[PDB]
Design a protein around this ligand. Structure first.
Ligand SMILES: *O[C@H]1[C@@H](O)[C@H](n2cnc3c(=O)[nH]c(N)nc32)O[C@@H]1COP(=O)(O)OP(=O)(O)OP(=O)(O)O
Ligand SMILES: C[S@@+](CC[C@H](N)C(=O)[O-])C[C@H]1O[C@@H](n2cnc3c(N)ncnc32)[C@H](O)[C@@H]1O
Ligand SMILES: [Mg+2]
Lengths: 255, 284, 255, 255, 255
RNA sequence: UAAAUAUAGUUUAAAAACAUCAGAUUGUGAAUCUGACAACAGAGGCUUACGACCCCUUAUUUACCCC
C-alpha cells in the first residue's frame, strides 16, 4: 500500500508528474511537487490538499534539489518514493544536407542536462535521504522510479538528443539498482510511449492524431493517469527492480 | 420553375442533351445566362452520363467474365496487406515532413477569378498534386494558404476528400503565406515572372497559385506577388524546351512533380519530363 | 478493476498460476484453473470457493483446451483474461565433451511443446473466446498474459531448451499483440526470475539458497503473490501492451 | 582466415546458405551443403567445385543430420564451422474475428520444427563433431552461426509462428554459448532484415519496390553476399560470442 | 574494401582507437588520429607512416573538432569513416550508506561530456564533412562507428556514470542512423566487453585475472586488434546500420 | 500585321488506354470490389443539329514589322 508514503515527484506541476501526484495523494500518500518556480506548481499543490506541497527547484542544480529534499523532510519527515518525471525535448536532425543545417551542440547539452544529468542528480541525493529510513519488514528503504521513453529504443528522426538522454536513463537503471541494493532502494524505469502531455501536444495536431492512430491498441495517446497507475504498481510490488517497463500500447516508432 | 418544362423541348431537337438531369443540375443551369452557356453545360452533362454508361456496361461485362472464370477452376513471409502497409508508411513520412519538410504553399486566393467549372478542376489538380507529394521519397510540407473555411474551394475539397480531409498531413490555414514565412524566403512561381528560375533552392518557400484559368487571365498571379513585395520566378521552359504550342502555364500536378524532381537533385532535363510532350518538340 | 472479470489461468493448480487465481478471486474475479488431471486442481478450485472451477486440460492438446474453454464459457458465460502459467523445465547441457553426452532431441521437443506451443495453443483459442465479448468502454475485449523467464535473456548452462521456449514467447508477444490489436485484446508477457515455486525448490537446497542471495534486492526468492500482483496491474492498466516485464529483483543470471 | 576450414551450411542449396557457401569456398574453405533432397543441392555443390559436397538431410531428423555430418567427416575429415540457414516462413494471423479464422496449431508446429527445433538439432550434433577437433592456438574448436530474423524483435501481423521460432533462436544463443564455452565453440546469431532471397524476389515488383523503400539505408533488399560477408567476419573474429547481430539496414518492421 | 578510405579515429593515440588506426592503415586506408594534445598521438602517427596524421583535439569542444576535421580535409581531401573511440570512466557508487558518500555531480558530468556529448559532437560535425562526399556506387557517403560498452546493458556497481554515457550512445544510434539515412551515412555502434586496453591492463592483477577468467570463451581480455577487425567488417559490409554489436566473448557482467 | 495553331493529369484516336481521389486487415489475380472525379483555350452566336461554319478575346509558333 502507498498509504502514508512520502513521494518526491520531479516535474510534478504538470503532465506525468502531476498525474502521479494526484493518484498517490488520492491513495493516501504525501507528495512533494519538485518543479521550476515558473511551472505553476504552487497552485497544483494547493489544489491537491494538505498532503501535497510545492518545492521549487531545478533538477540540474545540486543546491536546488538539496533545498527541495530539505523541504520534503521538514514537512513530512522522510522520503519513501522518488519519481523522476521532469524532461525536455528538441526536434532537431543531427545533420540536414539539403538545408546545410547541423544540430547545435548546446541543444544536445541542454537536453542531456535536464533529462539525464537532472535525473541522476535527484537519484543520488534522494538515495541519501532514503538511506536514513529504517528498513521495512522486507528490508526496503525506498523506491526510485525514472521516466525514460520509447525513444530510448526506437528514436525518431530529429530525436537524437532526446534518445541519448533517455537511453542513458535506461543504461544506468540496472547499475544504480545494483548500487542501492545493499541499502534496500529499488530503482525502476518506465518508458512511456505517446502520452497526452505538453511534450507531444506541441506537435502539429494532424501529426499527433496520426501518431495516436498508429498505437496498435488502444489507438489513442496514453492517459497520464495510466502512467500514474503503473507508478503505484511499481511502488506496491517489492520484487520489481532494475527493469524498464514500456508503457506504449505496443507502438514501435518509425523514422 | 418554367425551366423544367423549358428543357423538354430541347431534347426533341436532339441538341446533345442527357436523358436524366438531377434537380441540383437544374440550379446550375440558372447560372448559364446565354444559349451558348447552356449548350456547353448540357453537352457536359450528356458526355458525363455517356461515359458513366459506357464504363458501367463494361462493369457488368467485367463482372460476368470474372464469375465464369472461377466456376471453370504454401510458405509465405507476408500476408497480402501491401496497400494498407503502403498507406501507413506514407503517413509516417508525412508526419516527418510536417515537422522537417520544406514548405510548399498552394495559394488558394483565386476563388474570385474562377467559375464553377474552373474551381472544380482546381480541386482535381490539388488532389493529384497532394497524391504525388504523399508518395514521394522526400515529401514537401504542403501548405494550403488563404483557404477560406466557408469558401467554395474548401467545400469542394471536403467533398472530394470526405473524412480523409481532417487526416491529410498538410497545413491548411486561412492565413496568407506572408504571415507564416519570412518574405525574403518566399518565391512566388508564375509563368509571367521576368526572373527565370535557374536552380531549386532548399531554403526557399515556393508558392503556387491554385488557379485554373481556362479563361486565361495573364498577370493575375504576378499582380498578387507585386501587391505584397514577393520575389517571382518562372520555369525555364524556353531555355530547355523547343516550345511549339499550348499555354506555358502548366497544371498544378505538373508543377509539383517538376519541383519534387528538382528537390531530389534531378536536373532540368529530368524535371521537365512532366511538361506535356504535346507542347514542345524536345530538349534543346 | 478485476471485479467481475473471468480469468482462465493455465497451470493454475500450483505455483504462479495458483497464486494468480487466489489474488484474482480474492479481488472479486472468477477463475478457471486449467491444469493437468493429476495436478490436484479440483482441491484448489474447491478451496477458492464458488468463483473458481477446475478445468482439466493439457495445453499441448487443441481438444483439451477447447473443452476447458467450453467449461469456462458454460460456468461463467465469458472469458476476459487468460494467464499462461503452465511450463516445464529440463536441466541438460547441449553437449558435454567430458561425458560424451548430447542433449536429447525429445527433451528439447517436450519443453517447446508445453512452454511455447502450449502457450500459443491457449492464446489462439482463447482469442476466439474473447472475440465474442462486446468491447468495453475502452474498446477492450480481453487481456492475455504470458509467462516467459529471465532465461529468455540470460539463460544458464543447461537451460538451452528452456531459454528457447521462453525466447519464443518473448519473440511472439509483439506480433500477437499486433494481430489482436483490431479485436481489442492486449497481449503482455511477464519474465519472472527465481520464484519460490515447487520447480525451484526441486533444486538442491544449497543451490536455491545461494540463488536467493544472488538476487540484488530483495535478496530472496520471488514470492508467487508478487507475480499475481503484477498480473493484476497488467489487467487493470489499459495501456500496457506488447511488452515483456522482467520480475526478477534486478538479477542477471550467470553461467 | 577461413582458408582450410570446413563449414557445414544448413539450407546451403539456396538463398543465404548458398551465398555463404559461395563466399567461403571462394576464400579457400570447404563447404558441405546440408539441404533437402528435393533442393538443387547436388547441382550447386557441383557448381562450387571439389571443395563443396551436397549432403541431403532434413534438419528436423536426428538420423538425417547424423548421416550428413558423417559425410562431412568422411569427405573433409573435420567440421570447423556450422551455419544454420535452413528455415521456413508462414504468414497466418493468430485469430481473425471477421473471418472467424484461427491460426492452425499444425502451422505453428511445423515452423517451430524446422526453424527452431531443426536449428537446435544441428547445433547439438555438430557440437559433438567439433568437440573432437584439437583446439587451435586460441583454444577454439569451432564456430556455430545461427540465422534468426528481425521478426524475433519486431514480428509483423501474421508472423507469430515465425517470430516465436526466431525468438527461440535468439533466446538460446547465450545459453548454448555458455554451454559450449569450456569446449571452445563460439555460438553466434545473425538476425537478417529484408534480403533478396528467392522467397522475397518472387513477389510482385510493386511489393519488392515498396519493401526496398522501407529499408532506411541502403534503401534496397539485402544482398545475400552481405550475409555471407558477416558470416566470414564472425568466423575470423575470435571474440564474437553469444551475440545477435542485426543485419537489416537499420529497418524496424511496422505492423 | 577499406583501401583508399580516409578514417577519422577519436582517441586514436591509444587503446581501441590506436589498434583501429594500425589495422586500417595496414589495409591501405588513411587515418587521422584525433586525440588530446598530451596523448602522444604525434609519435603514433609518425610510427604509422605517411598515411596517418595526428590531429590534436578535445572531442567535447566544437572548435577543436572543427580544426581536426579541417586538418583531415586538408591532408587527405575527404572523410569516409569516423570511429569514435575517445572515452573516460569513473568508478564511484551512486551512494554509500556506510561511508555517507554521494557520487559527485561533477564526476557524472565529466564522463557524460567526453563519452556521450563528445561522441555526438564528432558525429554531427563529421556528418557535415561526409555530406560533401559524392555517393559511391551503393549511394554511401560515409560510415560512423561509435564505441559503447557492455556497461550500457549490465553496468556494474560504481559504473552509473559510465553506463549512462554508454546507454546514451546505444539510445541515439538508431535515431542518428535514421537522421543520416537519406544522406547515405551508416551509423553503427560496438559495445566491447573487457579489453586489454591500458586502463584495464593497469588495473590490479587480482581483479584483472578474475575478470579475464569470467569471459566464457575465449577466457581472456579482448585484444584491441579484435575490435579493429570488427570495425573493418562494419566498414566493408554495406548493410550493417543502426545496430549495436556486443564484442565481449559472451560475458554478462555481475554486480 | 498576317497565317496557322490551343486536349488543364498524360497520350492515342477521330472514344479508349494509362493515370488521380475516398473506402478495403486483401490468405497471395487487390491483376479486385464499391464509390468520387469526367468540360479538346475562352466568350458570343448561327444551324435540324455538328467537334461544322461565322465572330471577338487570350495564348503559342513561324514570317513581317508600317502605305
Ligand atoms: O494592329 C496591331 C498589331 O497587329 C500590329 N503589330 C504589333 N506588333 C507587330 C509586329 O511585330 N509586326 C507587325 N508587322 N505588326 C505588328 O500593330 C498594331 C498595334 O499594336 P498592338 O495592338 O498589337 O500593340 P499595343 O501596344 O497597341 O497593345 P494593344 O493595343 O494590343 O493593347
Ligand atoms: C496554370 S497556372 C495559373 C496561370 C495564371 N494565368 C497566372 O496568372 O499564373 C497555376 C499555377 O502554377 C504555377 N505555374 C504554372 N506554370 C508555371 C510556369 N511556367 N512557371 C512558373 N510557375 C508556373 C503558378 O504558380 C500558377 O499560379
Ligand atoms: Mg495540360
Amino acid at each position: 500500500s502507498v498509504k502514508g508514503l512520502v513521494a518526491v515527484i520531479t516535474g510534478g506541476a504538470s503532465g506525468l508528474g502531476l498525474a502521479t501526484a494526484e493518484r498517490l495523494v488520492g491513495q493516501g500518500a504525501s507528495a512533494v511537487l519538485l518543479d521550476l518556480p515558473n511551472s505553476g506548481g504552487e497552485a497544483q499543490a494547493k489544489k491537491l490538499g494538505n498532503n501535497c506541497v510545492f518545492a521549487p527547484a531545478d533538477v540540474t542544480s545540486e543546491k536546488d534539489v538539496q533545498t527541495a529534499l530539505a523541504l520534503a523532510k521538514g514537512k513530512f519527515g522522510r522520503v519513501d518514493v522518488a519519481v523522476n518525471c521532469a524532461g525536455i525535448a528538441v526536434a532537431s536532425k543531427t545533420y540536414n544536407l539539403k538545408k546545410g543545417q547541423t544540430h547545435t551542440l548546446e541543444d544536445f547539452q541542454r537536453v542531456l542536462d535536464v533529462n539525464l544529468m537532472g535525473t541522476f542528480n535527484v537519484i543520488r541525493l534522494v538515495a541519501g535521504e532514503m538511506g536514513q529510513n529504517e528498513p521495512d519488514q522486507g528490508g526496503q528503504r525506498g523506491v526510485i522510479i525514472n521516466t525514460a521513453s520509447v525513444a530510448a529504443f526506437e528514436g525518431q528522426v530529429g530525436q537524437a538528443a532526446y534518445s541519448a538522454s533517455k537511453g542513458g536513463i535506461v543504461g544506468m537503471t540496472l547499475p544504480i539498482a545494483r548500487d542501492l541494493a545493499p541499502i534496500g532502494i529499488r530503482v525502476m524505469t518506465i518508458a512511456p510511449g505517446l502520452f497526452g502531455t505538453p511534450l507531444l501536444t506541441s506537435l502539429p495536431e494532424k501529426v499527433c492524431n496520426f501518431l495516436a492512430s498508429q498505437v496498435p491498441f488502444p489507438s489513442r495517446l496514453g492517459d497520464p493517469a495510466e502512467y500514474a497507475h503503473l507508478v503505484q504498481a511499481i511502488i506496491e510490488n517489492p520484487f520489481l527492480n532494475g527493469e524498464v517497463i514500456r508503457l506504449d500500447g505496443a507502438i514501435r516508432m518509425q523514422p | 420553375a418554367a425551366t423544367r418544362e423549358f428543357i423538354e423541348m430541347w431534347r426533341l431537337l436532339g441538341r446533345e442533351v442527357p436523358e436524366h438531369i438531377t434537380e441540383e443540375e437544374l440550379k446550375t443551369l440558372m447560372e448559364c445566362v446565354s444559349n451558348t452557356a447552356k449548350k456547353k453545360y448540357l453537352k457536359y452533362l450528356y458526355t458525363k452520363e455517356k461515359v458513366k454508361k459506357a464504363r458501367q456496361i463494361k462493369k457488368e461485362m467485367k463482372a460476368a467474365a470474372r464469375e465464369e472464370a472461377k466456376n471453370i477452376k504454401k510458405n509465405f513471409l507476408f500476408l497480402r496487406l501491401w496497400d494498407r502497409n503502403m498507406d501507413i508508411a506514407m503517413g509516417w513520412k508525412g508526419a516527418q515532413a510536417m515537422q522537417f519538410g520544406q514548405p510548399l504553399v498552394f495559394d488558394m486566393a483565386y476563388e474570385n477569378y474562377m467559375k464553377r467549372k474552373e474551381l472544380q478542376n482546381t480541386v482535381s489538380q490539388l488532389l493529384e498534386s497532394e497524391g504525388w507529394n504523399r508518395r514521394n521519397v522526400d515529401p514537401f510540407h504542403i501548405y494550403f494558404c488563404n483557404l477560406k473555411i466557408d469558401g467554395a474551394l474548401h467545400r469542394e475539397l471536403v467533398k472530394r476528400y470526405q473524412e480523409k480531409w481532417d487526416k491529410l498531413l498538410l497545413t491548411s490555414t486561412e492565413k496568407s503565406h506572408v504571415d507564416l514565412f519570412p518574405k525574403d524566403s518566399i518565391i512566388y512561381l508564375t509563368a509571367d515572372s521576368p526572373n527565370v528560375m535557374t536552380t531549386f533552392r532548399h531554403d526557399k518557400v515556393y508558392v503556387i497559385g491554385s488557379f485554373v484559368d481556362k479563361s486565361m487571365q495573364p498577370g493575375t498571379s504576378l499582380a498578387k506577388a507585386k501587391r505584397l513585395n514577393l520575389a517571382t520566378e518562372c520555369l525555364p521552359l524556353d531555355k530547355y524546351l523547343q516550345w511549339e504550342i499550348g499555354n506555358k502555364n502548366l497544371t498544378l500536378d505538373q508543377m509539383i512533380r517538376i519541383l519534387l524532381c528538382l528537390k531530389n537533385n534531378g536536373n532540368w532535363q529530368e524535371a521537365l519530363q512532366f511538361v506535356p510532350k504535346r507542347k514542345h518538340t524536345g530538349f534543346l
